[PDB]
Symmetry: none
Subunit: 117 residues, 4 copies
């Protein structure tokens, strides 16, 4: 709620049209035709259950947006591109919380440079 509110406020300061989810990604941020989808996670490994993962992947696929995991850790705000997660044998999604990711400033720099995965 507080981390999520801070992310929404900081994306808005950078010129994004932002909405929170009321299957649906937690944050949807839009700028100059660029769609960013954020799923908030609290972890010391990142785990996304099959049903949640499938729904957000489907929303990402349909929207044509870029999906990221928002990994909130005390003193850390890292966005992990969904494609970096490993699909387990039963369809869950995993990655180490120390995997290379983006901080907020780099994510915004990524949107402006017109770069998506």
């Amino acid at each position: 709620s507080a981390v999520e509110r801070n992310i929404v406020s900081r994306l808005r300061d950078k010129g994004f049209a932002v909405v929170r989810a009321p299957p649906i990604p937690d944050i949807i941020a839009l700028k100059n035709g660029v769609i960013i989808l954020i799923e908030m996670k609290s972890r010391g490994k990142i785990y996304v259950r099959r049903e949640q993962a499938e729904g957000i992947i489907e929303f990402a696929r349909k929207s044509g947006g870029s999906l990221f995991l928002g990994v909130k850790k005390p003193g850390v705000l890292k966005f992990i591109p969904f494609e970096k997660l490993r699909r387990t044998e039963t369809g869950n999604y995993v990655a180490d919380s120390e995997i290379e990711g983006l901080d907020l400033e780099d994510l915004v720099r990524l949107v402006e440079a017109k770069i998506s995965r």
Copy 2:
């Protein structure tokens, strides 16, 4: 609300990723293959569509920042109608108006408009 629910469900049937606003946020945000559609629910009073300045400014700003296409979703039973925001006239005071025969797009025509944009 029932019209809004029906619009969300019908856009979902057409392959759109749809979210309802939880306000300077459009009521419906529909996304398909990189295309952004924004729908503000507005009822037709005395055959007129009348969007007050404050509401219009907030939704026009969300549309500008996002790079999305803005429409007014007609809050009516029956056949779904979507009015492109650009067909409305900005008044002297900054309000936005649509008369009686400013006919809106039906759902199929809106989807065909998105498809043409998707393929661009």
Copy 3:
């Protein structure tokens, strides 16, 4: 060439396996990016181009071939500005397609550090 050499040397200093495109290639058809830099599964592709009377022009057949190499490889394509001073890299997606299919860079891009950090932060692991 000095700018190209400066880019190759700095990418090598950052731990990249770097290769130049052969003079025995880029034959209008099947063009190969000028610089291919690889680091533990991360592919960076740079096409060198000079600033002429303000803009940067990439001919249709050259642009199409480098876009296709980038798409097939899964690499990130950039235009390396052939100018003195600050190494500037323009993401290929920022270029606009003209009426005839040529590509133009108007007026600002990434410096070397930003390119590297952003691309590695995006696809590494």
Copy 4:
């Protein structure tokens, strides 16, 4: 050279971005973020010899790039690729492998890539 040209053409038919290069592998082939590296080498009585100098440089390129290293057998007919790990290192540090070590065909090289 004809074998090298044929390898480049077949990889291109399979959707790879290929550079027939100018300590750099002869062929660098890229597909969906996957790096394949091919060093062209002749057979001598069913054996492929790689001088410690050349071997070290191509191993270093493969380590830095994160790519998979193979020896492309210079022979007519069916394309054969020997994974560099199949190279038995010698007393002097030189790398040796048998030309019939059951080296991969082109499809098996493409499959390792689609994984």
